[model samples]
Target: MGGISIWQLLIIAVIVVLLFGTKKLGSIGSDLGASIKGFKKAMSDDEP
Candidate 1:
């Protein structure tokens, strides 16, 4: 099976930074994080 193609892996690659475990401590965050999360949530639309 030709499962994961190159671009799929590439998306997963840069997905690291898009989903970065940042240096933001337990303080005020959500600059683009909130918008980005909202975008992903809307795109998924079926996740809890």
Candidate 2:
């Protein structure tokens, strides 16, 4: 199994999201979602 434990994982998660903030994460998530969607379309158009 991986060395990293749940405590460290959650600890980092809480830390990043702590300063990261929920609303900002939500905003970035949507922006990334849009890019992810556009990327698929771009890839689809690229395919033969």
Candidate 3:
């Protein structure tokens, strides 16, 4: 089977960006980052 080509990936990426947009995607990314960071800190601490 053939692997995905650059053009295919580029098209998909463009569609996703268009659908979710830079603003919404950026907000989602920021929130996700904050949650991951908080989780990591909590995991490192003895108390939950």
State each model's CA lDDT, in order.
0.64, 0.81, 0.81
**All candidates: TM-score:** 0.32, 0.39, 0.39
* lDDT of predicted model 2: 0.81
Off by over 4 Å in 3: 1-3, 24-48
Q: Which portions of model 2 show Cα errors greater than 4 Å?
A: 28-48
Summed backbone clashes in each candidate are 0, 0, 0
lDDT of 2 by residue, 1-48 (tens): 376888877888789888787777689868897898898888888578
Higher lDDT: candidate 1 or 3?
3
Q: State in Å the error of residue 35, model 2.
A: 13
Worst 10 residues of 2 by lDDT: 1-10
Candidate 1 per-residue lDDT, tens place, 1-48, comes to 278888877887567546765444212256666776788878888766
TM value for model 3: 0.39
In candidate 3 the C-alpha lDDT for residue 12 amounts to 81
Ranking by TM-score: 3, 2, 1
